[PDB]
Write a protein that binds this ligand. Sequence first.
Ligand SMILES: O=[P-]([O-])[O-]
Length: 155
Amino acid sequence: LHLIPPLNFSMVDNGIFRSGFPDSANFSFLQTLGLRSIIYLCPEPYPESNLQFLKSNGIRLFQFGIEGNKEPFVNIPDHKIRMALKVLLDEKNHPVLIHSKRGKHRTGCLVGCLRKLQKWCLTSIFDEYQRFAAAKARVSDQRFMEIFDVSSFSH
Ligand SMILES: O=[P-]([O-])[O-]
């Protein structure tokens, strides 16, 4: 028993995964997914370890750096989530891993906005968000999803 999925790893949909920050102990597991892309939601530069992994596996890195904030001073930037959604919705980029640091807040908001585009009721989106965020669930993340306007992605 030798494969180690990254922190808070899950399959979201066909070709879409979510996690926290992968380390070298997770690389043999991530190889089994045949990733084409990573959507990385933190502003910090990617470590050399991770860069060598992407190069060796032909994985494209999309970075939309969202600053970590604490409640009640959270300000999730709409523009970054929408740039990440544009990448996520293009099947040419699949399989894709979405990750942040913990895979709960930034990752949770992006997945919740995908669920809204997939026409899930808000209570079902919030339930999935809360399952990953657990004791760190933020009302501000769920409020962001509540008011997210799908109009410009509806097509
Ligand atoms: O690192 P994250 O849970 O936004």
